[PDB]
């Protein structure tokens, strides 16, 4: 039952419902966390 | 299709087999004077073979010796033509000849480089184990003696409950003719102990070194095998004493064909024989041990055994 349907689509990963804008915003947030404290205040 | 053509078929060729086309599958109405020829050709148009079939009133028969069809390869084109009297030849069948035979990819399967092999045995378990195959006396003719009254390692010997002389063969075979057998043995009684080299799978013919330890024997012999439990001596013999825990190295050398025995660390052969008439080579690389005691008690028996391929 699970093997061969949505339960294996989940194993496939982001083939069905998965959004681009949220992923891009998350990557931007991670980069901002990485780089914000080292940017100058000027 | 205004003009009829031939029929695509196949012809089977086999090495060492007569090439024959039976007449019952080439049936027809052939008047006297009708001929038939079969042409085998390669991919370039060159004739690899040409044969004439026996045309009778109702069939055409082909029959060729294997030497004629040896040189036609697998996949060569063939055409079969029938020429009626005063008429042009016509092709009945055409196609490719296949070779239906065992195919040998290796040009020469040389003897594989079976590397040197080594084995050892110490006899610490309860029973002998499957690595020793009993000979002559049959299954259940071997056993382990503890020798706890002398504080020595356990040894292999015939089970003296129902046997007095018995032989065992190593389960595996050596890969080369030259071998080395190192045995650590004890002399706790009176008897004869044979180290068997270059034996057959039944231990029928072999070289061997015999240690006789007794009140008067105290001798070492070179022996030739006739049966697992019977042997014949070669040459003279050397007097030898066997103490407990005595190590003897029996080396058989194929080149410079010889058998020799060394005691302990000395490289001088205590006994040596050369030119013994025993078959060698493949199938005669088995090693073994044998015991023969007049009484029903252990005599001279090994506590440790070791075999190495090559000298």
């Amino acid at each position: 039952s699970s093997g061969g349907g949505p339960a294996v689509v989940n194993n496939y990963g982001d083939i069905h419902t998965a959004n681009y804008d949220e992923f891009y915003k998350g990557q931007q947030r991670r980069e901002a966390q990485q780089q914000a404290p080292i940017l100058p205040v000027r | 299709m205004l003009s009829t053509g031939p029929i695509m078929e196949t012809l089977t060729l086999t090495v060492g087999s007569a090439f024959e086309i039976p007449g019952w599958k080439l049936r027809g109405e052939y008047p006297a004077g009708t001929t038939s020829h079969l042409v085998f050709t390669d991919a370039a148009g060159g004739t690899l073979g040409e044969f004439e079939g026996t045309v009778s009133a109702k069939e055409i028969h082909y029959l060729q010796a294997p030497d004629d069809v040896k040189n036609i390869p697998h996949g060569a084109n063939f055409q079969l033509f029938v020429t009626y009297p005063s008429m042009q030849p016509q092709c009945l069948y055409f196609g490719t000849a296949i070779r239906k035979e065992p195919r040998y990819p290796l040009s020469t399967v040389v003897s594989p480089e079976d590397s040197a092999v080594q084995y050892k045995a110490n006899f610490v378990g309860q029973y002998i184990g499957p690595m020793w195959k009993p000979m002559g006396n049959g299954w259940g003719s071997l056993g382990i003696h503890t020798h706890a009254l002398i504080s020595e390692a356990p040894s292999m010997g015939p089970n003296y409950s129902l046997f007095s002389s018995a032989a065992a063969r190593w389960l595996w075979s050596m890969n080369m003719d030259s071998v080395t057998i190192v045995v650590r043995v004890l002399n706790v009684g009176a008897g004869k102990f044979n180290v068997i080299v270059c034996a057959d799978y039944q231990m029928q013919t072999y070289l061997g070194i015999q240690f006789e330890t007794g009140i008067s024997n105290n001798k070492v012999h070179v022996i030739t095998g006739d049966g697992p439990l019977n042997w014949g001596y070669q040459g003279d013999a050397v007097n030898n004493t066997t103490a407990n825990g005595d190590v003897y190295t029996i080396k058989y050398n194929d080149l410079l064909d010889t058998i020799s025995c060394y005691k302990g660390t000395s490289l001088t052969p205590l006994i040596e024989a050369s030119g013994l008439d025993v078959p060698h080579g493949e199938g005669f690389r088995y090693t073994g041990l044998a015991w023969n005691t007049a009484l029903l008690s252990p005599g001279v028996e090994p506590t440790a055994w070791e075999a190495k391929d090559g000298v």
Partner: protein, 290 residues
Amino acid sequence: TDFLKIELIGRDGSHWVLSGPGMGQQGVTLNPNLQQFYDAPVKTLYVPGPFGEEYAGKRVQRREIVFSVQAYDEDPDTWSTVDSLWRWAWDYDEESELRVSTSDGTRFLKVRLMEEPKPYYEKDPHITADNPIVMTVTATFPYWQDEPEELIWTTLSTEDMTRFPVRNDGDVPVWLKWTLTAPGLWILPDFSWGNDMYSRGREDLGRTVAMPELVAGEHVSVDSDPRVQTLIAVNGMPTQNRWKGNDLLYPLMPGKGAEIPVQLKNAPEGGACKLTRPRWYSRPWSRPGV
């Protein structure tokens, strides 16, 4: 049927009749339901506009033909020979010819294996000796074509001119090929035929372009199709390097034809030219179009 014949000439030169008169004589017939075989696949382009979308042009796509053949014989050994020969008749690197013959003539398509063939049934094929091979072939050049029409004009004069009758009777524009001898300066026609692709449809009605002055022994081939470089010398000289960015821009549009002029000057020996007009079609058979 006798109205249509389909043949395959393999990369090895083998000849097979899949359908039509004499089909199956070599052991292979053509199963039904063959796709992307008739019309050349074309996709059209659209830009956003006030009333929805506006036409932007078309592009012709490569043919992805999927078809099944059936290889048959009475005995399994001969069937195996037939199957092996059929497999040998195909390749990936080089293309085999697929000819269609009707009352409109014979048109051929060059096809190669797009992927591995799918042979046989579920069980082993020696049981049946009659097995299907599904084949996914591809046509990089998607148009069906006939043998091109060739004309030759030779001269001995130092300066001369000639007229070549040209006419596209097919469905699609064709690109002309020229073979010009050396030495000599040629002027070749590049008529627009009213084609407005560069917004010069009637400005280039009588366009003629001068090839660079060919030196002795530098016979050139001038192929106007975009697949290949335009100017190529047979002695290896870099002819197009001397051409200042000039080129042939226009194909022979369908339904168009005229007496195109060829001019030769400064030819002390007096040279020759050959015009090759391809006959490309988008369909295996079609009535001629005026």
